[PDB]
């Protein structure tokens, strides 16, 4: 059950409103992550409000549910900004006052709403995280000079680019662990994802799980940081996958991982360690393909992505792919420290002269906005495309 049916009425009955906080990329340029917000406004100059309730777990991460839908939200938005840069990468996220942190809104589905994906549900880790970590280091980590709004990259996450090329909300659970999050927040595991997708969704309104696109990339966190084994991490990942389709799910886009170990920071990395991670991503592919066939054989709608071996391509002949540097990041960051992401930092000459939007790597960990957009569109054209939803 997770949440009683007493709880979810005595919680959608005390409707309030809030305000939307709606944030920018001040630059025109993608080699700036700087971003600043604005409050949403109507035509006429008066406050734009949203209608609904809020709730919160345990977590205390408090989530506003609202009759608006978020295209409503974002062309108020579009409209308050009222700027000419296409690359202002807008997101917005409900607060009472100056004092409130980016609370996700949920846009509460119709009664009648036809048998199609109507949103995606991202789980993972810094390669699906939209902004987690961001509001528990008070806005602080990743720095929001160099890293874009608590992305751990330039800009958007790749599922931002699936979501937003299907005109789709996106709701994210994902926080990653290479670049120290788990310092401020304790529950990143997959599990605790699921559980949280979970808690949260009774208290929709007219929420139908089979009309979700989930999607779902894990295990170099639990490789690359805690040394965890891999049959560890292939439970895990099992587990998620039994959890979500018993509780209705029936839509996925899974992905084989990326070899990790062709990231800046194994530069600094000894031999051993390398292939020992490499080893694991390797098996954990294997067992991916299987888990995806395994769904695919029950009547599942899989999307699985090879993203291992168009990594391989992609960093082996950058100059094949619209890049010229898959070896270095885009900051001029030449160590492995966690607490380079709490500074700002300046491109290297390379990127500065390339543009980031020409480099795979945008920090030593984590790939550019433009790798992103480059897997979201590769996956997006796969499967003749989508045809499986
Ligand atoms: C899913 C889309 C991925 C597209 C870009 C490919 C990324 C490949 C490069 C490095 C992989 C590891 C980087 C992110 C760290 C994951 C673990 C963590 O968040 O702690």
């Not at 108020?76 to 807008?90: F, S």
């Not at 949920?106 to 810094?126: E, F, R, T």
């Not at 401020?184 to 929709?204: C, F, H, N, P, W």
């Amino acid at each position: 059950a997770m949440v009683s049916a007493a709880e979810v009425v005595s919680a959608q009955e005390n409707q309030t409103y809030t305000y939307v906080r709606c944030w920018y990329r001040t630059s025109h340029s993608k080699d700036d992550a700087a971003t600043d917000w604005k409050w949403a406004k109507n035509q006429d100059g008066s406050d734009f409000t949203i209608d609904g309730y809020w709730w919160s777990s345990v977590s205390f991460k408090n989530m506003f549910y609202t009759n608006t839908s978020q295209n409503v939200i974002r062309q108020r938005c579009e409209e308050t900004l009222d700027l000419a840069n296409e690359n202002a990468d807008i997101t917005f996220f409900a607060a009472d006052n100056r004092y409130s942190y980016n609370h996700t809104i949920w846009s509460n589905d119709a009664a009648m709403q036809p048998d199609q994906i109507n949103k995606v549900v991202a789980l993972g880790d810094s390669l699906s995280d939209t902004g987690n970590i961001f509001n528990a280091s008070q806005w602080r980590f990743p720095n929001p000079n160099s890293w874009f709004l608590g992305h751990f990259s330039n800009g958007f996450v790749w599922t931002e680019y699936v979501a937003k090329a299907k005109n789709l909300p996106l709701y994210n659970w994902a926080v990653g662990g290479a670049a120290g999050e788990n310092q401020y927040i304790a529950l990143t595991g997959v599990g605790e994802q699921v559980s949280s997708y979970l808690t949260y969704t009774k208290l929709a309104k007219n929420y139908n799980p089979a009309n979700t696109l989930f999607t779902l990339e894990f295990g170099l966190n639990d490789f690359m940081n805690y040394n965890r084994s891999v049959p560890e991490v292939k439970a895990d990942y099992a587990e998620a996958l039994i959890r979500l389709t018993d509780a209705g799910a029936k839509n996925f886009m899974l992905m084989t991982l990326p070899d990790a170990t062709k990231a800046p920071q194994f530069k600094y990395s000894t031999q051993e360690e390398i292939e020992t991670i490499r080893a694991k991503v390797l098996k954990m592919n294997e067992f991916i393909k299987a888990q995806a066939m395994y769904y695919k054989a029950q009547g599942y709608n899989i999307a699985l992505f090879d993203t291992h071996a168009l990594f391989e391509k992609l960093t082996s002949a950058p100059e094949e792919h619209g890049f010229v540097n898959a070896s270095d990041p885009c900051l001029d960051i030449n160590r492995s420290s966690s607490v380079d992401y709490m500074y700002t930092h300046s491109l290297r000459s390379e990127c500065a002269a390339s543009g980031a939007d020409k480099f795979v790597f945008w920090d030593v960990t984590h790939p550019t906005t433009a790798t992103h957009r480059y897997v979201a569109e590769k996956m997006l054209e796969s499967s003749n495309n989508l045809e499986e939803f």
